Design goal:
This is part of a larger assembly, with eleven protein chains of ten kinds. With 184 residues, chain A is mainly α. Chain A is built from five helices and one strand; from the N terminus they run E-H-H-H-H-H. The longest helix of chain A is centred in the middle third of the chain and has 47 residues. Chain G has 266 residues and is mainly alpha-helical. Chain G is 32% helix and 0% strand. The longest helix of chain G is centred in the middle third of the chain and has 36 residues. The two termini of chain G are 40 Å apart. Chain I has 153 residues and is mostly helical. Chain I is elongated and about 100 Å long. The chains are: A mainly alpha (184), B alpha+beta (49), C mainly alpha (73), D mainly alpha (196), E alpha+beta (71), F mainly alpha (140), G mainly alpha (266), H alpha+beta (159), I mainly alpha (153), J alpha/beta (241). Strand 2 of chain B pairs antiparallel with strand 1 of chain J, so a sheet runs across the interface. The structure holds magnesium ion (MG) (5 copies). One magnesium ion (MG) binds next to loops of chain D. Chain H: InterPro entries: Transl_elong_EF1B/ribsomal_bS6 (IPR014717). Chain H: One of its GO terms (cellular component) is mitochondrial small ribosomal subunit. Chain B: This is Enoyl-CoA hydratase/isomerase domain-containing protein. The PDB classes it as ribosome.
Chain lengths: 184, 49, 73, 196, 71, 140, 266, 159, 153, 241, 174
């Protein structure tokens, strides 16, 4: 029978089944395409893919799509799950702020420590310890140091991990990325 | 309303650019008003018997 | 039915202050000493003539954060 | 005197009438319990019932905060390891141990960095216990039923719009294409419940 | 709002205003102004149950100042 | 010994406790101290006594003529608080009073939000902190 | 009693009173250590950042001009408020003034049915990045819910301290040992120190204190990756067993065993 | 405006486009209404392919903007006239033009309480801004403000 | 406001329909969506296409002949201020060439690394404990079921 | 360095410092340094930025308008605060199709669809004609009567399938091109558009088996078409709801 | 009261038409986003309170300094005179104004009335901008302050400020 595109049985391969829509070039997906990336010359498409997937996963879009596209759930269970999600979020936010309000104190104590180092060894000395080019006679030394800093600052492409999808038996959640039990 | 429909497409150097067709005219206008302001103020400083 | 662990020993968050407030001890000790049968402790011998401030009220009884309750703090 | 006012000789000192009928509550709060450990309901650390609480739900994610041992965990050196990996993959005729030296330098520092972060985090656990945690004494805020009153306020509103009638009522879900499959004279979109 | 409910009086909620404002330890209460209400206020202020009161000739309400002693 | 803790609170835990050299406020503090020792009063009760004690008419509005944010200087407080423990017979060896009152403050100086305290854990109450985490305690 | 922000029982601060730095450091102060002291100056009155959302739900976002273009005919300005898929952000992620939300969902609707915006996807996604506050990991915004960034800067500054310490331990080391190139027999170190300390020890110059050292280094070239041929035993065809593998004894004292661990589909 | 339309049309030979627009226009005049502006745009490439009366999906379409003053009774007739025409792929209708979203919310209007005549006088272009609009019009606007306010009475009190 | 009367209708329609006629000496006005649309000659066949769309137009109907349509140019100041505009655009393309991605040097050397670390993550994953329910068959499920039902004996 | 320096012989230099010129100078100096510093200890990053800007800059009366004038200009107050660039604005920041794919009559569209228990790949001519059939994780063996369903839709299966498909895809492509007279004899790549569906494990591996073919296939555009359900017909009912 | 929708309690000290806060059909409160400055989300907002604390300030008298000329020349703005103070001011409450009940609570959804928050759009000031100066210049309004001549607001102020209400409630001895 007619299935939607995100349906389980959507694109079937069988003797009866035949795919629907213009399937190439200007296609069925014409204005329905969620992402587009022009591949930068000499860039493997694996970085492209892992960037896309990290994006979708971190913003909880792949969560949503997996969730809704597998089973039906009544508007009550959907509400319960979404608002539960959002309230757990709220709680953990109010935890993060506490942690952060402490870590800014820790960072302060560190900077203070740095001040005490300053008036033990004198300011200029401390600056020397931190990579100040006081030994730079001419610009060529400067350009060596700054060439070093350039070769550091240039960012090698980050390969960001995407948690695998866990296929369980009757699939209570197809959002399952871990083996922990969940409240449905 | 006939202001907002007055934009236009020109090619500057090698690149495409959207400009107002009337922009320079408004610049002349605003400049003239500024010069009249200057006249007015300089004239308030003029000798007052 | 799951509940936060220590709810058994949970303090009364409105009234747990009352017990400790200076006026209460002033009154109680006041009618204890009045009996004639109790030797007054010395703090009473002192604050007898310098009773504590009037209008300092907790935030528990008055639910106003903006009320500046204490002349001191 | 020699110890706490909330704890007498035989256990927690039983103030409310619940303690006198149920005096198991005085001497046993769990399997992390000791006798000095009464009245301090949280037990030691790394110990059973040592976890601090935040608005009643316990804090079991601490390491995940400072980014030690988490999936989202903070990584110190990336550029190095990538650089070195590139070196290994390119060719075998030239071998660069220069990269492996920059990297092992990086690591050598990383160790002390991590011990520092851990120490600072334990100080955070201490501070959080002193000045924030309620010691599991307040009602959970983190699940929707705890907020029922809030939702009630919304249901009430949708009722007063309906002439103060249908509480908790919602529009009948129609069909995937109810609007275009129905003939003239039948409702093609879901109405307010009172409107039925 | 309905039949079975009591029929309230300016005196009824005058008393309950004052009671609740006394429980929350407030200095001032805005309270309904009718003949017997501000009568009640003058009598209470006679006996010294109330620090003070005033009618501003505001139609709806007038104000009472509460007195606390020993906390 | 809990006495030193109490005195630490009166010294460091109170914004603007008037001029603590003046014989009036000084006597307040003296009496309350002798009442925390010899168990005649709870620490909480004696603290709330101290901060609610009678000082001077229009106190805040005289405080606007000295303080900006209402935080006075802490020297008078510590000098008075040591003085009281010396004049009362609190310790067998005279120095110990001053030393402990000083030391306990210096250790707390390094702590995050050092001079504020949660009102429940600040003093004696049903539920307490473990002896390591108690505030001006010797075990921190 | 709860603070509003995270529910703290105190009001956050670092220092309060004018005297505390003095009184804490008093012996140093009479001594005169504290004269040029920049630690007692810089951080003396230093207080915490304000970590607060001035807009918990932004009535500020967007600034006024933007509203003009929130209509159906500005695909770009629609796009700066969506995800890269075109969906809206949940309220507690990207908060918007309710006007903006109305105008935006209406816009995307209209634009879609007129064919001026795609049914999925954000066509302006890259162009719009200027308008979004992209936050560099190098700057620090005192207000973030990011717990990573905070600890990153903590790391950074602490390591900046460690650098100093290490610099000045290797310096004084270099001068204690370089004194020997300055004075061979010069003395300047005690005779008893000549007896006891001139011998190799774990503090002086140990050989190596740890297992798995590096011995036998050579210049030989790298080999081909995966020189090894797969073993005859197939690891692929074997199924991994965890829970039932060994036999266990339950420490359960009383009551029914928890239904969530076992007896409950994941 | 009182009403506006965006009409996505099939890109035909010019005589046909002109006939169709004459049909819509005459359909507006017969029904006792006015045309503030009939604006033409080019043949564009939309984000969604439209099918025409031939059920042949189209990659390109001609866009046409209508701005009308009608009664709300007889624009039902014009509506089902326009939507039922074979050369119109799609038509979206804006009725919000007299009270648009950005006004009359908690006394935002200074010196007046909902003056309706502010947005009626205006055309759609200045109520809803097009993307090309930049800070440059902030200039032009005021030269068209000040200038206007100078010549208005003198022009009006002439006759 | 210029209201189109019934008399002026077809004249005004034609004035607006000839707006883009595919040649002029003057710069063209944009859309309400702010695009430069296709230039049709008389009778509305599409003669000239703007450079953003040329690829797809040509790919869909190759037989169709159309020209890339360039705006009429206008120069501010001299060719000097224009060369300075050129320096500005090349400098912005330089800061963006810096910021965009470094990508090492050679492609295959990078791809090898990415795939390696994906593999290592795959086999550090395979060592995680699963849940009891995932691991066991229906056999022992039924075993524990009967074992539970009969428990009262 | 133990070269005796007498404090009396310096006197001339000290007298130079009593002159109000040099003290005017120390005043200017100290008043320029008295603005509040946000620098604190020496920073490598900021030094680098500073000197990089120095390399970039080394490579490098009219009546004041009063408050009344800006009182009368309503526009100006809105220009000062505006986000909108004033001047000629770049067109590439307007046009809809600026950031979007640009296709060619010769392109091959590779579909990698990852499903939960399955993965498959297909390829299509730009004109929509199917090249080779759909090679599927159950079509290639690789699935049933085996290890389990848990691993059925896994990464390595997707890899097996895609890498098996491309191998068979090249020759048929050269034949379909030989039919119209496009030889593509040597030193050519197929320009490929990889369209990926599904957010399932079998996706990762799939694209990897494309990347190792980079000497044969050249990927211009990577765009994923993944259906999103706003709402629609009911999905099959699961266990709980 | 443990019943949901009855949580707002019994407050008499409100200005509403019921002493039972939870039967009041006017202002539905918001438990999640409310009560930063007022303590609990049940209690009345700072500007609507009909009962006042000892050490807390009471309401500002609205103006809508010139009239202090007789006073201390340095005396700045009196703390209780405010330009904008509205006793009738609608505070945004989600369950009323943004109501997600009839939806699945997805990101854009819920019905919104915009009549609450003042419009931050630029549409308003553009659409109404006129060469004729505003209401104040035109002096369209009759009346003025509703109490007529007021020493603080309209007329000048002489003598001394009573900041506590001490002279304002006293009993005539005569
Ligand atoms: Mg059938
Ligand atoms: Mg149960
Ligand atoms: Mg229990
Ligand atoms: Mg337990
Ligand atoms: Mg059932």
């Amino acid at each position: 029978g007619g299935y939607m595109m995100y349906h389980r049985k959507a694109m079937g391969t069988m003797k009866y089944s035949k795919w629907k829509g213009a399937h190439g070039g200007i296609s069925h997906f014409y204005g329905r395409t969620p992402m587009v990336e022009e591949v930068r010359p000499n860039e493997p498409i694996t970085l492209v893919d892992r960037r896309i997937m990290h994006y979708v996963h971190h913003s909880r879009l792949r969560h949503f799509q997996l969730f809704r596209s597998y089973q039906e759930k009544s508007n009550s269970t959907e509400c319960k799950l979404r608002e539960g999600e959002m309230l757990r979020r709220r709680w953990h936010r109010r935890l993060q702020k506490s942690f952060i309000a402490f870590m800014q104190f820790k960072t302060m104590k560190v900077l203070e420590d740095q001040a005490r180092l300053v008036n033990t060894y004198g300011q200029a000395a401390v600056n020397a310890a931190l990579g100040d080019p006081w030994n730079a006679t001419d610009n060529v030394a400067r350009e060596r140091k700054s060439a070093a800093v350039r070769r550091q600052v240039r960012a090698l492409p980050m390969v960001n991990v995407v948690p695998k999808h866990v296929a369980t038996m009757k699939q209570i959640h197809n959002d399952r990325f871990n083996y922990r039990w969940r409240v449905n | 309303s006939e202001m907002f429909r007055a934009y236009v497409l020109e090619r500057r150097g090698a690149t495409d650019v959207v400009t107002h067709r009337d922009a320079e005219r408004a610049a002349a206008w605003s400049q003239q008003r500024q010069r009249e302001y200057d006249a007015y103020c300089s004239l308030k400083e003029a000798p007052h018997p | 039915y799951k509940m936060p662990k220590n709810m058994g020993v949970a303090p009364r968050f409105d009234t747990w202050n009352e017990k400790y407030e200076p006026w209460e001890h002033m009154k109680r000790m006041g009618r204890l000493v009045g009996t004639g049968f109790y030797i007054p402790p010395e703090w009473y011998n002192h604050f007898r003539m310098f009773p504590p401030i009037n209008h300092n009220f907790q935030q528990e009884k008055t639910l106003n954060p903006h009320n500046a309750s204490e002349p001191t703090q | 005197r020699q110890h706490d006012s909330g704890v007498n000789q035989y256990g927690l000192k039983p103030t409310n009438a619940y303690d006198y009928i149920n005096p198991t509550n005085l001497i046993n709060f769990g399997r992390g319990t000791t006798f000095d450990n009464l009245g301090v309901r949280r037990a030691g650390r790394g110990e059973i019932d040592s976890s601090p609480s935040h608005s009643g739900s316990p804090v079991f994610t601490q390491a995940k905060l400072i980014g030690l041992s988490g999936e989202e965990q903070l990584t110190m050196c990336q550029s190095e390891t990538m650089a070195l990996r590139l070196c290994m993959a390119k060719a075998g005729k030239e071998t660069c141990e220069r990269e492996s030296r920059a990297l092992d330098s990086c690591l050598g520092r990383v160790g002390h960095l991590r011990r520092a972060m851990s120490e600072a985090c334990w100080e955070f656990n201490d501070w959080f216990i002193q000045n924030v945690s309620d010691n599991h004494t307040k009602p959970f805020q983190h699940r929707p039923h705890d907020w029922r009153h809030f939702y009630a306020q919304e249901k009430l509103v949708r009722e007063r719009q309906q002439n103060g009638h249908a509480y908790g009522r919602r529009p009948k879900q129609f069909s995937f294409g109810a609007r275009y499959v129905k003939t003239d004279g039948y409702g093609k979109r879901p109405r307010l419940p009172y409107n039925k | 709002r309905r039949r079975e409910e009591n029929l309230y009086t300016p005196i009824y909620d005058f008393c309950h205003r004052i009671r609740e404002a006394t429980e929350q330890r407030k200095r001032f209460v805005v309270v309904p102004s009718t003949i017997e209400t501000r009568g009640c206020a003058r009598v209470m202020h006679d006996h010294g149950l109330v620090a003070g009161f005033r009618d501003f000739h505001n139609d709806r309400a007038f104000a009472v100042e509460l007195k606390y002693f020993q906390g | 010994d809990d006495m030193f803790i109490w005195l630490c609170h009166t010294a460091m835990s109170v914004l603007n406790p008037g001029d603590m050299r003046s014989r009036l406020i000084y006597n307040h503090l003296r009496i309350l101290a002798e009442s925390v020792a010899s168990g005649e009063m709870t620490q909480r009760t004696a603290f709330r006594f101290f901060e609610s004690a009678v000082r001077s008419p229009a106190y805040r509005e005289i405080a606007k003529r000295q303080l900006e944010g209402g935080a006075a200087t802490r020297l008078a407080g510590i000098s008075a608080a040591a003085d009281v423990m010396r004049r009362m017979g609190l310790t067998r060896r005279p120095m110990s009073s001053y030393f402990e009152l000083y030391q306990r403050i210096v250790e707390r100086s390094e702590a995050m939000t050092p001079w504020g305290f949660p009102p429940l854990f600040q003093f004696e109450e049903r539920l307490s902190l473990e002896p390591r985490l108690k505030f001006f305690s010797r075990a921190s | 009693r709860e603070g509003w922000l995270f529910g703290q029982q105190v009001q956050l601060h670092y220092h309060r009173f004018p005297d505390e730095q003095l009184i804490t450091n008093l012996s140093r102060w009479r001594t005169g250590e504290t004269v040029g002291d920049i630690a007692m100056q810089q951080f003396r009155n230093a207080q915490p950042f304000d970590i607060e959302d001035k807009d918990p739900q932004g009535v500020q976002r967007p600034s006024p001009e933007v509203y003009m273009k929130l209509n159906y005919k500005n695909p770009a300005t629609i796009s700066r408020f969506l995800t890269r898929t075109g969906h809206m952000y949940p309220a507690d992620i990207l908060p918007l003034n309710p006007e903006a939300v109305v105008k935006l969902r209406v816009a995307k609707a209209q634009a879609i049915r007129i064919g001026l915006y795609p049914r999925f996807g954000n066509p302006f996604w890259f162009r719009s990045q200027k308008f979004r506050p992209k936050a560099y990991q190098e700057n620090y915004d005192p207000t973030t819910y990011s717990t990573k960034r905070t600890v990153e800067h903590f790391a950074y500054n602490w390591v900046q301290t460690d650098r100093i310490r290490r610099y000045f331990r290797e310096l004084e080391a270099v001068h204690t040992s370089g004194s020997a190139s300055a004075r061979g027999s010069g003395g300047g170190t005690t005779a008893e120190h000549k007896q006891q300390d001139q011998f190799y020890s774990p503090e002086n110059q140990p050989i190596s204190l740890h297992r798995n050292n590096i011995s036998y280094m050579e210049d030989v070239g790298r080999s081909v990756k995966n020189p090894t041929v797969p073993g005859l035993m197939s690891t692929k065809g074997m199924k991994k067993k965890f829970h039932n593998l060994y036999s266990s004894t339950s420490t359960k004292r009383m009551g029914f065993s928890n239904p969530t661990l076992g007896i409950k589909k994941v | 405006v009182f009403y506006s339309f965006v009409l996505v049309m099939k890109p035909r030979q010019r005589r046909f486009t002109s006939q169709a627009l004459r049909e819509i226009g005459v359909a507006v005049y017969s029904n006792g209404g006015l045309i503030r502006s009939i604006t033409n745009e080019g043949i564009m490439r939309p984000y969604s392919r439209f099918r025409d009366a031939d059920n042949t999906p189209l990659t390109y379409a001609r866009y046409i903007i209508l701005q009308l003053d009608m009664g709300e009774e007889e624009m039902g007739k014009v509506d089902k006239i326009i939507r039922e025409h074979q050369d119109v792929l799609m038509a979206l209708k804006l009725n919000n033009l007299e009270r648009p979203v950005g006004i009359r919310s908690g006394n935002k209007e200074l010196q007046a309480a909902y003056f309706p005549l502010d947005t009626f006088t205006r055309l759609e272009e200045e109520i809803n801004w097009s993307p090309q609009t930049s800070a440059d019009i902030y200039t032009q606007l005021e030269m068209n403000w000040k200038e206007f306010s100078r010549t208005r009475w003198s022009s009006f009190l002439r006759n | 406001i210029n209201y189109v009367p019934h008399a002026q209708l077809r004249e005004h329609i034609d004035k607006e329909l000839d707006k883009y006629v595919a040649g002029k000496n003057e710069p063209y006005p944009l859309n309400f969506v702010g695009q430069m649309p296709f230039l049709e000659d008389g009778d509305g066949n599409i003669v000239e296409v703007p450079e953003s769309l040329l690829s797809n137009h040509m790919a869909e109907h190759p037989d169709s002949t159309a020209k890339p349509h360039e705006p009429h140019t206008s120069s501010s100041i001299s060719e000097a201020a224009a060369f300075e505009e050129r320096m500005l655009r090349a400098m912005v393309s330089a800061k963006e060439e810096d910021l965009k991605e470094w990508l090492g040097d050679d492609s295959r050397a990078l791809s090898e690394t990415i795939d390696d670390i994906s593999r290592e993550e795959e086999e550090r994953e395979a060592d995680i404990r699963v849940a009891r329910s995932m691991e066991e068959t229906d056999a022992e499920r039924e075993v524990s079921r009967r074992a539970y039902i009969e428990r009262g004996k | 360095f133990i070269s005796p320096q007498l404090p009396q012989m310096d006197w001339r230099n000290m007298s130079a410092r009593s002159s109000e010129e040099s003290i005017r100078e120390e005043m200017r100096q100290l008043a320029e340094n008295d603005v509040m510093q946000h620098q604190r200890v020496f920073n490598e990053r900021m030094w680098y930025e500073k000197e990089e800007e120095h390399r970039m800059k080394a490579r490098s009366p009219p009546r004041v308008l009063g408050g009344d004038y800006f009182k009368t200009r309503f526009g100006y107050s809105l220009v000062k605060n505006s986000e909108m660039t004033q001047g000629p604005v770049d067109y590439s920041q307007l046009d809809m199709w600026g950031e979007m794919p640009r296709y060619t009559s010769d392109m091959v569209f590779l579909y990698l669809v990852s499903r939960r228990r399955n993965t498959y790949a297909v390829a299509y001519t730009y004109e929509g004609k199917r090249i080779l059939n759909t090679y599927t994780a159950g079509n290639r063996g690789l699935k049933g009567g085996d290890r389990g369903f848990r691993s059925e839709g896994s990464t390595d299966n997707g890899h097996q399938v895609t890498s098996m498909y491309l191998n068979d895809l090249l020759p048929k492509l050269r034949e379909m091109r030989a039919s119209e007279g496009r030889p593509m004899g040597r030193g050519e790549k197929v320009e490929l558009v990889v369209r990926v569906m599904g957010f399932y494990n079998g996706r990762q591996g799939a694209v990897r088996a494309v990347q190792d073919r980079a000497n044969e296939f050249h990927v211009r555009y990577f765009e994923d078409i993944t259906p999103f359900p706003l709402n629609g017909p009911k999905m099959p009912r699961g266990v709980f709801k | 009261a443990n019943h949901p929708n009855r949580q707002s309690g019994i407050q008499f000290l409100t200005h509403y038409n019921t002493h039972q806060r939870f039967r009041v059909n006017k202002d539905y409160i918001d438990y999640m986003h409310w009560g930063k400055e007022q303590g609990q989300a049940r209690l009345p907002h700072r500007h609507q309170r009909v009962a006042f604390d000892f050490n807390d300030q009471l309401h500002p008298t609205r103006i809508g300094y010139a009239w202090f000329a007789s006073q201390d020349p340095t005396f700045g703005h009196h703390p209780d005179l405010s330009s904008s103070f509205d006793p009738n001011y609608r505070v945004f409450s989600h369950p009323e104004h943004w109501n997600k009940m009839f939806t699945k609570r997805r990101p854009g959804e819920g019905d919104i009335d915009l009549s609450v928050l003042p419009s931050r759009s630029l549409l308003g000031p553009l659409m109404a901008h006129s060469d004729t100066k505003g209401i104040p210049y035109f002096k369209v309004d009759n009346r003025g302050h509703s109490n007529g001549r007021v020493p603080g607001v309209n007329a000048p102020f002489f003598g001394e400020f009573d900041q506590k209400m001490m002279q304002a409630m006293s009993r005539p001895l005569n």
